[PDB]
């Protein structure tokens, strides 16, 4: 246990770091798009209230960004610290994209800094749109390049194993692996979405309370519609990635959906409770999706989990996360699909609290679904790294350091999150 506790403690710590990282990240990915769009709408419509919401957002986008950065640095450093023997092999292949993430971030950060410090000096709004286009591009460029890491971690290749030593590396084979499309796509969509609901959860808070229809109805009207779109696309690329899994790595998917048994028409599950050792309690399940319109043939035989080695299978507490993520997906898409529809273009239900409440919950629900989703996709992963890559159990280092540094970091992040939330509310209550 002087070199086996860390197998667990490291996992735990890394979760605690990155779990914090993402709160301050998918915002970094989705917000800038939304800002660009707000600017563009303000410009195209000659309505200098959207142009105020662009900056009104940016002014906190900064603080989000910075907290993102420090947690980023944290995880970045923690990477090869907690998992040396991993990077000993794969570092050669991961090195580039990881760099390209932060490079793309600096590239966006320049223009972000320009707009931030030229919108109050130099001329014309288009010339500030042209400064906000590169930003969101660089943001999504981060996600692209960094996700390509996880996509790769999930799947080879671009390498060869000389008795353990990883060589003969092709950049774009490892980068543009089979998972990369669905990861990049689903991550970008479910990050435009999230922030799209997050701004709606401001507009629905401020409009609900001190009903300054002014910005706050326009804000909702836009954010909600875009949120709808992004949730739709998100769900689509969700089905896509699900199919990818069913085809390429059913170990996750069969654990998500508890398909111990291989079958043609295999039902999905809405929620259940199988405690790790076969204890089927709540059982609410529907016939199969990812075959009828995915594979175009309902009787496409889904690989079962029994057919996966029990040293190669991940937990069964994955299902709950699929439940969470998906159901939040659908519910939130429905709320979004109604708002603009029923509450604006039909029976004027906007001013009703029955919406504003749900729309206040909206963003938080999405971020939740994010954490959940990441847990799902990442925790279906633990028992593969130990094989085609290298033993997870032989990836960590020492114990009596990690246990404490974990708690230090825990405290630190606790402070970060709280403080950031506080300041980031204070600003909005100051009304700049």
């Amino acid at each position: 246990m002087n070199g086996y506790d860390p197998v667990l403690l490291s996992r735990i710590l890394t979760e605690l770091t990155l779990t914090v990282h993402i709160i301050y990240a998918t915002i970094g990915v989705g917000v800038p798009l939304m800002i660009a769009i707000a600017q563009w709408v303000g410009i195209r419509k000659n309505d200098m209230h959207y142009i105020l919401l662009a900056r009104r957002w940016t002014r906190g986008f900064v603080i989000t960004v910075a907290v993102g950065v420090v947690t980023g640095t944290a995880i970045g450093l923690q990477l090869s610290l907690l998992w040396p023997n991993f990077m000993q092999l794969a570092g050669q292949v991961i090195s580039l994209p990881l760099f390209m993430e932060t490079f793309a971030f600096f590239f966006e950060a320049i223009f972000l800094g320009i707009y931030l410090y030229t919108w109050d000096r130099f001329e014309n709004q288009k010339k500030h749109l042209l400064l906000l286009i590169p930003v969101a591009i660089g943001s999504s460029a981060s996600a692209m390049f960094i996700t390509m890491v996880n996509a790769f971690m999930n799947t080879p290749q671009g390498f060869e194993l000389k008795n353990g030593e990883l060589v003969n590396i092709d950049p774009i084979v490892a980068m543009f692996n089979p998972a990369m499309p669905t990861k990049v796509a689903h991550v970008l969509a479910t990050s435009y979405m999230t922030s799209a609901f997050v701004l709606a959860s401001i507009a629905a808070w401020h409009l609900w309370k001190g009903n300054r229809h002014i910005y706050h109805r326009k804000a909702l009207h836009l954010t909600m519609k875009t949120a709808f779109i992004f949730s739709v696309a998100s769900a689509l690329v969700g089905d896509l990635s699900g199919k990818f899994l069913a085809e390429y790595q059913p170990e996750k998917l069969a654990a998500a959906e508890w398909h111990f048994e291989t079958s043609s028409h295999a039902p999905l599950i809405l929620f259940g409770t199988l405690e790790e050792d076969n204890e089927v309690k709540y059982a609410l399940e529907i016939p199969y999706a990812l075959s009828i319109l995915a594979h175009n043939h309902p009787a496409a035989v889904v690989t079962g989990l029994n057919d996966i080695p029990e040293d190669e299978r991940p937990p069964l507490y994955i299902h709950y996360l699929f439940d969470v993520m998906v159901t939040i997906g659908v519910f939130l898409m429905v709320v979004a699909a109604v708002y603009w529809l029923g509450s604006i273009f039909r029976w004027k239900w906007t001013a009703k609290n029955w919406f504003f409440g749900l729309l206040v919950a909206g963003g938080p629900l999405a971020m939740i679904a994010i954490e959940a989703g990441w847990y799902l996709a990442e925790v279906g992963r633990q028992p593969w790294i130990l094989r085609g890559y290298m033993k997870t159990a032989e990836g960590a280092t020492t114990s009596a350091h990690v246990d404490t540094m974990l708690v230090l970091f825990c405290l630190l992040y606790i402070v970060l999150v709280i403080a950031s939330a506080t300041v980031l509310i204070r600003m909005f209550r100051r009304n700049p």
Binding site: R44, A185, L188, Y192, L222, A233, L240, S241, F345
Partner: peptide
């Protein structure tokens, strides 16, 4: 090939749809 490419497409579509909202039912409506 089609289902390997498709996602990013779906995304790219969702983006410029999300823009198109700003012209359709934002500029010339509500």
């Amino acid at each position: 090939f089609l289902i390997m490419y498709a996602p990013m497409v779906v995304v790219a579509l969702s983006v410029v749809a999300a823009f198109w909202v700003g012209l359709k039912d934002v500029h010339v409506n509500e």
